[PDB]
C-alpha cells in the first residue's frame, strides 16, 4: 500500500494503476478502517523535495499513456498532445506552465542585485538564442551606464535597457506588450478580454511550437535510429537485440525484494500474455473481460 501522502496525489489523477490502488484503498476505508493522520511537519525543503519526487509518480504513468502525434498532418494533433500534457501537468500538481516557470524565476532570482546576475543564474532555464540577444543589449546599456545595471526598475538605465529588451522580445516574435499587460492585469474585465485573447493565442502558438519541436526531435531521432538500423544484416540485428534484451532481463533479475524489479518481471509476463492473446484470436485482438 501507500504512506498516505502518496495517496492524496493519486485521488485526482486519472491514470490506471493509480486508480486501481486508490480504489483498493477506498475499499479498505469502507470496512471500518480509519485514515492515517497527515504529518503537519517536514519544513519547506522536505516539502518541495517530496512534492518533486511524488509529482514524478504521477507524470510518469501519465507520459506513457499519451500518444505522440508523429508525422500526422495539420496542427490539431499537436494540440491534442500538448493539451493532454497540460492536463497531465494539472493532474500531477503543477500549475499552468507559464506561471510555473515564472515561479521558478522567482525562486532562482529572489536575491539578485544586478541584471547580469539575472542573466547568469537563469541561463539554463531560458533559450540561449534569446540569452545571447539579451547579453548583447546588456553590454550595450552597460557601456553607456559605465556601471552594472542594478535590478530595481526605478533606474533610467534599466528603463533604457528594458525599452530595447522589449524591442528584441518583439523581434523574436512574441508580442511583449500583450504579455506584460495580461500578467500585469487590468481592472475592467471587458477591456482585459481582448488582451487575454491575444495572450492566449500567442500562448497556444507557443506551446504548439514547444510540443511540435519535441515531436520533430522524436521524428529525427527515430529516423536516425532506423537509418542506422537498416544498414545492418539480420544476423547482427537478431543477436544484438536478443543480447540486449537478455542483458536487461538479467539486470532486472539481479535485484530481488525491491518493488521495481518485481513489477518489471510482472509486466514481462503481461507482454508474454498479450502475445498469447493476440495469437489466439487475430480478428479481435486481446481478450478483455467485460
Amino acid at each position: 500500500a501507500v504512506s498516505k501522502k502518496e495517496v492524496l496525489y493519486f485521488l485526482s489523477s486519472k491514470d490506471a494503476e493509480s486508480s486501481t490502488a486508490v480504489k483498493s484503498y477506498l475499499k479498505s476505508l469502507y470496512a471500518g478502517a480509519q485514515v492515517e493522520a497527515t504529518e503537519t511537519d517536514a519544513s519547506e525543503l522536505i516539502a518541495q523535495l517530496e512534492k518533486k519526487y511524488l509529482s514524478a509518480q504521477v507524470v510518469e504513468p501519465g507520459v506513457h499513456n499519451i500518444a505522440l502525434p508523429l508525422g500526422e498532418s495539420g496542427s490539431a494533433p499537436v494540440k491534442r498532445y500538448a493539451a493532454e500534457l497540460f492536463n497531465l501537468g494539472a493532474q500531477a500538481g503543477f500549475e499552468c506552465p507559464f506561471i510555473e516557470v515564472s515561479k521558478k524565476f522567482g525562486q532562482e532570482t529572489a536575491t539578485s542585485e544586478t541584471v547580469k546576475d539575472v542573466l547568469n543564474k537563469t541561463k539554463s532555464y531560458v533559450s540561449a538564442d534569446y540569452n545571447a540577444a539579451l547579453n548583447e543589449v546588456l553590454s550595450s546599456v552597460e557601456a553607456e551606464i559605465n556601471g552594472p545595471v542594478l535590478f530595481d526598475g526605478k533606474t533610467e538605465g534599466f528603463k533604457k535597457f528594458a525599452a530595447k529588451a522589449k524591442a528584441v522580445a518583439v523581434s523574436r516574435g512574441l508580442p511583449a506588450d500583450t504579455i506584460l499587460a495580461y500578467c500585469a492585469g487590468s481592472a475592467n474585465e471587458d477591456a482585459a478580454d481582448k488582451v487575454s485573447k491575444e495572450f492566449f493565442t500567442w500562448f497556444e502558438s507557443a506551446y504548439t511550437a514547444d510540443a511540435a519541436a519535441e515531436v520533430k526531435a522524436i521524428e529525427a531521432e527515430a529516423a536516425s535510429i532506423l537509418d542506422r538500423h537498416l544498414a545492418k544484416p539480420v544476423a547482427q540485428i537478431r543477436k544484438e537485440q536478443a543480447s540486449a534484451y537478455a542483458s536487461l532481463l538479467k539486470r532486472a533479475e539481479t535485484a530481488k525484494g525491491a518493488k521495481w524489479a518485481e513489477k518489471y518481471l510482472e509486466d514481462v509476463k503481461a507482454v508474454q500474455w498479450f502475445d498469447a492473446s493476440v495469437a489466439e484470436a487475430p480478428a479481435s485482438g486481446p481478450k478483455v473481460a467485460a
Binding site: 518533486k52 501537468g89 545492418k232
Partner: protein, 176 residues
C-alpha cells in the same frame, strides 16, 4: 466528459449520409421512432427526449489496450510508417532475375558480372533487413527513455523554449 450533457433529440441528426447504413428518424414531440436500415438487418426503436438524457449518465471511459504502452505503440507506429517509406523504394528496384541467364554471363566482363552478382546479394541483404518487422518493437524502446526523461522535469512536463522565453520577458520587463 462533464457530469452533465445538454444534447439529445433537439437539433438532432435526422438522416444518414451513407448508403452503407440508412437512418430515418420519426421524431415526435414526446417520443421518437428511429427506423434504421443497415444491411440485411433492420431496427425500429423508440426513444423519448428524456430517454436520451439517460445516455450520458454512466460514462464510457475508453482506453487503449496496448502491448507495452500507448507512447511506445506510437513510436513503433512511426517506425513502421518509416519502414514503409523505405520499403516502397525497395519496391522500385529493377528485376535482375531476368538477367540471371548464362547468355548475359558470357557476354559480360568478369569484373562487371562480379559487381552485378554482388549488387544482387546486396539487394537481398537490404530486403531481408527492411522486413525484420519484429525488431521495431525493440527499436522504438531506445527512443522512449530520453523522451520520458525529457517530460519528467522539475518544473513542468510541457514546458519548453518559447514559453520560457515569454515568461522570461514577462519576468524581466516588469518592475524588477
Amino acid at each position: 466528459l462533464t457530469t452533465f450533457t445538454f444534447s439529445g433529440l433537439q437539433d438532432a441528426p435526422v438522416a444518414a449520409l451513407s448508403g452503407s447504413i440508412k437512418l430515418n428518424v420519426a421524431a415526435k414531440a414526446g417520443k421518437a421512432e428511429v427506423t434504421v436500415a443497415a444491411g440485411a438487418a433492420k431496427a425500429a426503436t423508440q426513444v423519448s427526449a428524456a430517454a436520451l438524457r439517460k445516455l450520458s449518465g454512466s460514462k464510457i471511459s475508453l482506453a487503449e489496450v496496448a502491448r507495452i504502452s500507448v507512447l511506445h505503440s506510437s513510436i513503433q507506429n512511426y517506425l513502421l510508417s518509416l519502414s514503409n517509406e523505405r520499403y516502397q523504394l525497395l519496391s522500385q528496384w529493377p528485376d535482375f532475375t531476368t538477367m540471371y541467364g548464362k547468355d548475359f554471363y558470357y557476354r559480360a566482363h568478369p569484373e562487371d558480372l562480379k559487381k552485378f552478382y554482388d549488387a544482387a546479394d546486396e539487394y537481398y541483404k537490404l530486403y531481408e533487413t527492411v522486413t525484420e518487422f519484429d525488431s521495431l518493437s525493440a527499436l522504438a524502446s531506445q527512443v522512449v527513455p530520453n523522451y520520458a526523461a525529457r517530460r519528467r522535469s522539475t518544473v513542468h512536463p510541457a514546458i519548453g523554449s518559447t514559453v520560457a522565453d515569454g515568461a522570461f520577458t514577462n519576468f524581466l520587463l516588469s518592475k524588477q
